[PDB]
């Protein structure tokens, strides 16, 4: 019996063999001009033909062909908007896309194929979309849940999704009355994502929502340690650990893989303080839908 949403969830209405063709409605850079790398927020039309749910992804199939003449493989992007969507009419889907550009060992500049196609979209352009995809990051059934959201970079996306539904929307069948606790880790302030929206959420539910930023290149603690997501977490170390002992606490983790390890190590020494092996406790939390990871 899932402790996560299941009623009204659909997957794979569309597959790479025959994508849905939507339209770019808007596409906006949301990071500052001095960030290490651009992140863009973009909204596509779906004529309501893709009724996704908070937590899910869609695939994009970028135009053109690879080096061997085959069409490009789907790349997945976590849905950044709530089920009803940025326009609130249930006919749009939004993404939060990091433009991948990197220099390889040979000295060449390489452009990530789907991320640059997405980030290049003009309003009016056609996008080939598939999905919805995934059950793993669905929201808890429990409306009074403690939802702890651990994000790095574009891993804010499904949580932007959760939090829109929890705090910006009225729904007859869902009134969130738990604690939403968001941690978001980026390397610079200009890398921060949706700060203003979370600001608004903190304002209207101060008792139900918390947000903590961890900006590794601009923040330290007084021990001189850089503020990665795990080092921000360390400051609420026992509070979080208490919360984890509860029936109604669900942890979700989204973003770059390798965010994972730093967090485990904080948990490891929390666990040992109790005689407990963290990994036993973890896999056991997973079995109760309480530690949900989607990193990439």
């Amino acid at each position: 019996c899932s402790k996560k949403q299941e009623e009204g969830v659909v997957t794979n209405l569309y597959k790479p063999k025959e994508p849905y063709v939507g339209r770019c409605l808007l596409n906006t850079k949301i990071t500052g001009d001095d960030a290490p790398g651009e992140t863009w927020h973009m909204v596509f039309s779906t004529e309501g033909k893709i009724p996704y749910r908070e937590g899910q992804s869609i695939g994009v199939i970028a135009d053109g062909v690879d080096k061997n003449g085959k069409p490009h493989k789907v790349r997945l992007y976590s849905i950044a908007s709530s089920a009803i969507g940025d326009f609130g009419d249930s006919k749009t889907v939004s993404l939060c896309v990091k433009r991948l550009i990197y220099t390889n060992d040979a000295g060449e500049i390489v452009k990530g194929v789907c991320s640059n196609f997405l980030c290049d979209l003009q309003p009016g352009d056609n996008v080939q979309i598939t999905g919805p995809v995934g059950k793993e990051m669905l929201m808890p059934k429990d409306p009074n849940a403690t939802i702890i959201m651990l994000a790095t970079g574009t891993g804010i996306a499904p949580f932007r999704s959760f939090l829109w539904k929890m705090f910006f929307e009225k729904h007859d069948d869902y009134k969130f009355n738990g604690l939403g606790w968001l941690f978001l880790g980026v390397p610079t302030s200009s890398s921060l994502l949706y700060k203003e929206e979370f600001g608004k959420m903190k304002e209207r539910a101060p008792e139900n929502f918390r947000v903590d930023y961890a900006v590794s290149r601009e923040q330290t603690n007084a021990a001189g340690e850089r503020m990665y997501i795990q080092t921000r977490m360390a400051e609420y170390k026992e509070e979080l650990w208490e919360l984890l002992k509860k029936d109604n606490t669900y942890v979700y983790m989204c973003g770059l893989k390798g965010m994972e390890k730093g967090i485990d190590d904080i948990m490891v020494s929390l666990a040992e303080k109790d005689g407990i092996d963290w990994f036993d406790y973890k896999k056991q939390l997973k079995r109760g839908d309480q530690w949900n990871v989607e990193v990439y």
């Binding site: 019996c1 009623e7 059934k141």
Partner: protein, 92 residues
């Protein structure tokens, strides 16, 4: 992980070992026991049983109200065991 569910049918009394994540009907089916069922979706009466002792997780079924749930009505197609359980089957 696994519980003993005793199934009291109009033909007597059977014992099953049901995993905590397999629906009771489904185990029943696996072990050759014929229980009535129709929607198999937790929104009709067809597989109605009654819990005589023990407890079930009925995973947000649609048919039974709180009153009835409180009375010990179970939808045997949509119920997981949360303990050792004795159910009376065939109960429309």
């Amino acid at each position: 992980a696994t519980y003993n569910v005793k199934l009291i049918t109009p033909e007597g009394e059977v014992e099953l070992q049901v995993p905590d994540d397999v629906y009771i009907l489904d185990q029943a089916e696996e072990d050759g026991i014929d229980l009535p069922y129709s929607c198999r979706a937790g929104s009709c009466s067809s597989c109605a049983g009654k819990v005589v002792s023990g407890s079930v997780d009925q995973c947000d079924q649609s048919y039974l109200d709180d009153g009835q749930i409180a009375d010990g009505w179970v939808l045997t197609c949509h119920a997981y065991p949360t303990s050792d359980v004795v159910i009376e089957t065939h109960k429309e």
